Every structure is written in structure tokens, then in C-alpha cells.
Design a protein around this ligand. Structure first.
Ligand SMILES: Nc1ncnc2c1ncn2[C@@H]1O[C@H](COP(=O)(O)OP(=O)(O)NP(=O)(O)O)[C@@H](O)[C@H]1O
Ligand SMILES: Nc1ncnc2c1ncn2[C@@H]1O[C@H](COP(=O)(O)OP(=O)(O)NP(=O)(O)O)[C@@H](O)[C@H]1O
Ligand SMILES: [Mg+2]
Ligand SMILES: [Mg+2]
Lengths: 387, 385
């Protein structure tokens, strides 16, 4: 009844733990069909039960690793370790480390600042037109906050130093900072034990591991010239087309014939695959190696030029609407977008208008022709016949 | 390229202005089809060009007014003023005012705290199972931050005082707090001048007004026993079914016949209308008077029990998929949900699972029967043939 009990102020850290949803997604169970990678089965679509926020904190660190390839093209490798019985995840990358030096304005070492303080980022100057996935200065701190133990190790040959420090108890405490002389090949390694109590979980079970492994395959398929290892084993992905092939390799439509798959690497920032869908519009897409599971204007931009060209082919053969065409399409898009926007930190839907992408993606006349002859025009014409 | 230039830390306020999208949505132009209310023809679906974030800061204040009906059910009225020429918006409501008193913990007057300080809310104790739209403690400060001038006035007969304070320059400064004795009918009035430069706009033009006006119609239809006024004109909505009718006034399908509409007020927290769609699945829904324009589990919870009963009807008469059924559905849902969750501050998609809703919505067998007899079972059954 008290004014002080009714009206409350929260610190930023308190607010994240109290209201996790707009930061990392739901911290409750969801049961739905998802693409996952099962041991001994590979890529497959099945019902899974998982906590989105746990999936996301892993994603934040993984995308950070991919981002470093854009910062340093000499980077060649990402190594992911998932150890359920010790509740341990590690993500390692090479290329240039984080400067191991005191930040003259914030008065702490750079790695401690950008992993241990909210709203810290190298991505706050949008006069630079970057195709990194990082935008907001939260992601790594979010993983820290939802971890019981969160270790940052980064080595900077330029500064001849190596940094290592561990946070604990939801970024509430930090152990001792370790600084050692260094003169090798740079790397960064983030090792964390997710706070499964925040997710009402007891361990990294089969389903969340299958999702995390598939996400590592996503990275292998969406990045260029980065080898990806999962628990010491190299992942056999070479390019986005070979990644898409894992989804469609033996796939048949419902009459029994194999799916017709249309591909174009339109340019160095856009790659597209199209086939037929029997369950409504489907899209699997990436922006700067972020899995945009709810799509966005990058998907609309590519799909719409297919749809309008197909509605024009169907009209020649007569009343059909664009949503009808789109419901027969399964599209794959891998895109690099400058300074993308999203309506949430989880970055599931990319909202930037095409005029601001920094590149274009006009599908070739070769691609469009093959799209006309891939079964979508057929199914539509049988429906208007059977009217 | 110095380390201090590369790696930067932002205050919360700086971060909101630098990265508005996760707080209020896009601050750039968007062109798409929207339901609006034009001073010409009324509710209608047409292409508009508008800035989502400007639309959103208006919504935050409007939903706050609607929230006060849950706080004080004797509240009866909301009045909205939109004045493009002076770039001024006001939202007024009656019912209980904000307590005009010094907060013993934060050591400022309550209205100053909850309109001038980030992460402040009456909605942070989830042991109270409330059906208010406010959850995060941002909305009103976001409107303040994206305004050149932002004025709060609230009168509390209980505290026998009236409060008034004005912020300016993106919540960068505040004027003086004005306190006067008060002994009339409580009210709260929020008046703001949106910072149109932040939205790269020149004035509150035709399209953004039509969106704001339809949103005021939304409030009149989603709330109970609240009259809604816009520029002194009462909005002629009484109950959710009458609001849905404004969408269905032009009631003809593509065959020429009048639209068949199935309705049920399931309980005090759920009201559902269903009609047919020829443009794919459509949903218009609200959670605690939030316009959930991207839907959510409240929509799924309702639509799915319609779909599953229809899929069971087509089997009797035969391989059909659920998306096929859904594509012929245009559904309206007005729900009150306890402590809802959302993907983003903009609250366009409600993510809370049904087991946590705090109520159920099992559609009546009469509703289901009428839904079986609406043409959706018909067209699909000829399709499988
Ligand atoms: N593996 C890494 N290698 C090099 N720099 C890194 C790495 N991970 C993080 N960083 C740096 O640490 C900063 C903070 O990371 P993070 O908190 O994830 O924010 P962000 O990536 O910039 N934006 P976001 O992820 O959208 O919230 C980044 O901006 C990078 O400068
Ligand atoms: N018109 C109003 N009448 C009464 N109380 C109000 C009114 N507007 C705001 N408040 C109070 O001010 C607080 C701050 O509002 P706001 O910043 O919108 O946060 P919120 O509504 O609690 N959550 P959110 O909108 O999801 O960020 C609310 O929790 C209310 O208690
Ligand atoms: Mg990041
Ligand atoms: Mg609010």
C-alpha cells in the first residue's frame, strides 16, 4: 500500500534480471518445431523444448566471434566447446585481440570495460558503415549477467600483453585481473557457465545442444573464410550453398518428386536459394551472421522481386494475389547489411529499409527464369483450374 | 584511431537517442498499408508514410491513460488533443491522480520520479498479477526523451495537492515543479511537443494524424466503460463488437455477399470476432489495450482452437494442413493478460505462454459450430477433392 513499495526504481542490472525478455528473449520454456542438428542425424526439423534466453546468450558470444572477421580479415578460425556435464561453454577465435591497455577516459583496461560494463561497444559510430552484427553494446554483458561464471581471455601482440579476468554471480563480482607478457598470435576466448537457474533448467540437454550445434553450422555457412570447430571437430561446410544443401538434399515435394533448388551468389554481400514450400512461406536468413528467424526487409527485398515476376507469369495464363505466390516459396538469404536495425536486442527481425542497406540485390534473369520453372507456377495454375 | 575513440561507453539516455529502434521502433520513414481514420471516410485501409517511433511515443502515453482504468475503475474518460499547427499533443484522463508526495526512497516527488527518471514503474512487483499494459518502466520517459517539451500535470484530492512540471530538450532539463492545493476531481494530463527533428519531419502531417486517431478508436473499443474524446469530439464506439464493425462496414467478400461474422464475449477478459479473409491470415488484436500488431500467443491460443476443430471437420468428409485453414481467417481478439511479456519495448508481439495468462478462453460450442458453417470448411473441402 506504501508509495515506496508501489513506485520503484531499478538499476540497469536489476532491470535486466527482472525483465529479461526484451534483452535476451523468453526465460520460460517454449515447445515448437525448429531446425536443429542432431548427433548421427544431422540437420532436421522437429519439435524441441528449450528456453530462448539460453540459446540467445550463447548466440551473442558466437556472433561476436564472427564479427571479429570483419574487424580483422586475417582471422581464420572459431572453436566452440559445449560441455554439458560441467555446464561449460567456450568460444575462441583468432585474429586481432582486444587492446590490452588502460582506457584513458573510462579508467580501466579495455577488455574489463567492454565485457563488464553495460552500454560499451566499438559500434557506436555509424559514420563508419560496418557489416558487423554488433550494434548496441549489450550482448556480451547479457551473457555475463546470465552466467554464474564468465571468463574473458584476450591476447594482443600489438600491446604485448594478455588479459584474463573472471566475473561471477550474474556479473555481480569480478575476480582478479591477470595481465601477462605476450608475443604470439592474437586470440580471444570467452568461457562461461550459464546460470541455468535463471532459465529453470538443470543441464544443457539434448535439445538446447542440438540448437547450439546447428547455430555453429549457421556460422560456418554464413561466414566467408572462417573454419568452425565444434568440440575439436571441424564442421564440413564450404559456403552458403553447401549449408543450404544440408536442408534440401534428399527432400521431396508431396507428389513424390524431388525439390527444384535455384541458387545465385548475387554479389559478395548477397546469396540466395529458392525452392518450393508445401507449408506456406518459409525463410531461413542471416544478416551479418545473425540468424534473423523472423525475417526482415532483407528477405522481403529478395522475395518480393520473385513474387511480382511470378504473379506476372500467372496472369499471362488467365486473378492470383501475391500472398498466394509467396505461400509456395521457401527462400534462403545470406546478407551483409550496413548498420542494420532491429526492433529488439534479440535481432530476430531486421527493419532497415533497402535504400540504406549499402548494397543492392537484383536477381539475374537466369535466376528468375529458373524460378518460373521450379513448381510454384505449376501448383498455382492447378488451383485456379480447380476453382 | 585511438582506443578511446574506438571503444565508447554511453549513458542510458545517450543510448536511447543513439539507438532508438529497440526502444520506440524505427525513426526513419516507412511506407506501407495501415488501418487509419481519415477526416474524409473514416476507418479505412490505405498506404501511409510515417515514422514508427513518433507513432509509438504517442501510444505509450495513450496506453498509460488506459492503464489508469485498471488502477481506478471509477475512471470514466480519456480526452486526446492533436494540434499539428503548434506541434502539441495532450492526453487527459480522470480517475485517481498520481500521489503528490516525496518518495522516501528516491527522495523526489513521485510524479517527477516516474516521468523523469529511467526504469521507474508501479509494475515491477510481479506478485501482483495486473492486467495493465505497462511492464518496463520506460514508456513515458521515452516520450519525454523524444520531445522538445514535455509537461506532466496530475491532481490528487487524497494528497490535497496538484503537481505540474515541464521537461525540455530531450529530457535534458526540467523547469520548476509547481505545487498547488487541490480539492476537485482527480485527473492526469500529459502534454508534449514531439521533437520532429529526431524523426526528420516537418509537421504532424495527414498520415501520422490518421494513425493516431485510429489508435484513439482502438482505445475506445478495447477498454470497458471509458468514453474517448479527440479534439472535443466523442468517439462513437461502445463495446468491442461495435469497434470491429467499423472494419467490416464495407461488408462484401469477393463473391458479392455480405460478410459473415461470428462473435463471442467468452468472459470478462476475452472477446473474439471471426470472419473470412481472401488476403491470407489476418489478425487485429489487443492485450491490456496494447495494439499487438504482430500478434502473439493470445492470438494463437484463440485461432488454433478454431483451426483444429475445422481440420477435424474436413477429415470426417474425406491430408489438410493447418496453414490452409488459417489463410481464410480474419480474427479479432481483445484480451486481458496477467503480467504479459513481449519481444521488445514496442510490444507488437506478446510472447507469454497460455498457462500463465491468468484466465482461459475456451470458445463456446455455438461459436465453433457457427465457425464450421462459415464457408472456410467449404472452400477447403473442394480443394482436397
Ligand atoms: N571475440 C571478440 N573479438 C574482438 N572484440 C570483441 C569480441 N567480442 C566482443 N568484442 C568487442 O566487445 C564489444 C562489446 O561486445 P557486445 O557487448 O557484444 O556489444 P556489440 O557486439 O558491440 N553490440 P551488441 O552485441 O548488438 O549488443 C564489441 O563492440 C567488440 O568491440
Ligand atoms: N496517466 C497516468 N495515470 C496514472 N499513473 C500514470 C499515468 N501515466 C503514467 N503513470 C504512472 O507512471 C509510471 C511510469 O509510466 P511508464 O514509464 O509508461 O512505465 P510503465 O507504464 O509502468 N511500463 P512501460 O510503458 O511498459 O515502459 C507507470 O507505472 C504509472 O504508475
Ligand atoms: Mg555483440
Ligand atoms: Mg507505460
Amino acid at each position: 500500500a506504501s508509495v515506496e513499495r508501489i513506485y520503484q526504481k531499478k538499476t540497469q542490472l536489476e532491470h535486466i534480471l527482472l525483465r529479461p525478455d526484451t534483452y535476451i528473449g523468453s526465460v520460460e520454456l517454449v515447445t515448437q518445431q525448429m531446425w536443429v542438428y542432431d548427433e548421427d542425424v544431422g540437420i532436421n526439423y522437429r519439435e524441441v523444448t528449450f528456453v530462448p534466453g539460453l540459446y540467445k546468450i550463447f548466440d551473442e558470444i558466437l556472433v561476436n566471434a564472427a564479427d571479429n572477421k570483419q574487424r580483422d580479415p586475417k582471422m581464420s578460425c572459431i572453436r566452440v566447446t559445449i560441455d554439458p556435464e560441467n555446464n561449460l561453454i567456450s568460444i575462441w577465435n583468432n585474429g586481432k585481440g582486444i587492446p590490452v591497455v588502460e582506457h584513458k577516459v573510462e579508467k580501466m583496461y579495455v577488455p574489463a570495460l567492454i565485457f563488464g560494463q553495460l552500454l560499451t561497444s566499438s559500434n557506436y559510430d555509424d559514420d563508419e558503415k560496418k557489416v558487423t552484427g554488433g550494434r548496441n553494446g549489450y550482448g556480451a554483458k547479457l551473457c555475463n549477467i546470465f552466467s554464474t561464471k564468465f571468463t574473458v581471455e584476450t591476447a594482443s601482440r600489438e600491446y604485448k600483453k594478455m588479459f584474463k579476468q573472471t566475473w561471477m554471480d550474474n556479473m555481480g563480482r569480478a575476480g582478479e585481473m591477470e595481465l601477462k607478457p605476450f608475443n604470439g598470435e592474437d586470440y580471444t576466448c570467452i568461457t562461461f557457465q550459464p546460470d541455468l537457474s535463471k532459465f529453470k533448467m538443470q543441464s544443457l540437454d539434448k535439445d538446447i545442444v542440438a540448437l547450439m550445434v546447428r547455430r555453429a553450422y549457421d556460422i560456418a555457412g554464413s561466414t566467408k573464410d572462417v573454419k568452425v570447430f565444434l568440440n575439436g571437430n571441424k564442421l564440413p561446410v564450404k559456403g552458403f550453398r553447401s549449408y543450404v544443401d544440408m536442408y534440401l538434399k534428399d527432400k521431396l515435394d508431396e507428389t513424390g518428386n524431388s525439390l527444384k533448388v535455384i541458387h545465385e551468389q548475387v554479389n559478395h554481400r548477397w546469396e540466395v536459394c529458392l525452392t518450393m514450400s508445401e507449408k506456406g512461406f518459409q525463410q531461413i536468413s542471416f544478416v551479418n551472421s545473425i540468424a534473423t528467424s523472423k525475417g526482415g526487409r532483407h528477405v522481403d527485398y529478395v522475395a518480393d522481386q520473385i513474387v511480382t515476376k511470378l504473379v506476372d507469369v500467372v496472369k499471362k495464363k488467365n486473378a492470383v494475389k501475391a500472398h498466394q505466390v509467396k505461400n509456395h516459396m521457401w527462400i534462403f538469404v545470406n546478407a551483409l547489411i550496413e548498420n542494420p536495425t532491429f526492433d529488439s536486442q534479440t535481432k530476430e527481425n531486421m527493419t532497415l529499409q533497402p535504400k540504406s542497406f549499402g548494397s543492392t540485390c537484383q536477381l539475374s534473369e537466369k535466376f528468375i527464369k529458373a524460378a518460373i520453372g521450379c513448381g510454384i507456377v505449376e501448383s498455382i495454375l492447378n488451383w485456379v483450374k480447380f476453382k
